Design a protein around this ligand. Sequence first.
Ligand SMILES: CCCCC[C@H](CC(=O)NO)C(=O)N[C@H](C(=O)N1CCC[C@H]1CO)C(C)C
Ligand SMILES: [Cl-]
Ligand SMILES: [Zn+2]
Length: 149
Amino acid sequence: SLKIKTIGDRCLRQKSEEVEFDKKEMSELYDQMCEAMWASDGIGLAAPQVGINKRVIVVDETTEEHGKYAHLMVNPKITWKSEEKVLFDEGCLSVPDQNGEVLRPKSIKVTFQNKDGKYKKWKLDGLAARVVQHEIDHLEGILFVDYFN
Ligand SMILES: CCCCC[C@H](CC(=O)NO)C(=O)N[C@H](C(=O)N1CCC[C@H]1CO)C(C)C
Ligand SMILES: [Cl-]
Ligand SMILES: [Zn+2]
């Protein structure tokens, strides 16, 4: 099963590579990433956090109505960010026992390939916009603690 790597591991600082979508590969990776995310009470996860330096993220959207669900986003790319920013207190599964208030755009538009390999573009706000930005930072070798200096 996947093990979440923590600060000190160079895999967290190596940028991740664009993916040629392979439906069976991604289905298995999705299953394992979701398992690792939920097992540690996370609400998003990026492939480099489990030692796989490929541009793949999962984003939780669990609800009372539908139960556990997560989005797969393959090659997520931000095409637009709101001018308005918001402060939010973040923690990271790759950075034990640290937290802090991070300023990021409130809303974004993001393209990606989904679980079925379909090309999507979504406008996101609130927590979803927040999670996606945190996860794309991982794909660029950025940890949220880098924003404090
Ligand atoms: C908010 C932006 C980052 C969220 C993603 C992380 C997981 C992660 O490291 N992904 O790279 C998470 O679940 N972090 C949790 C987190 O920061 N929480 C979860 C609820 C909201 C927020 C606390 O303000 C902790 C408690 C595990
Ligand atoms: Cl929200
Ligand atoms: Zn993180």
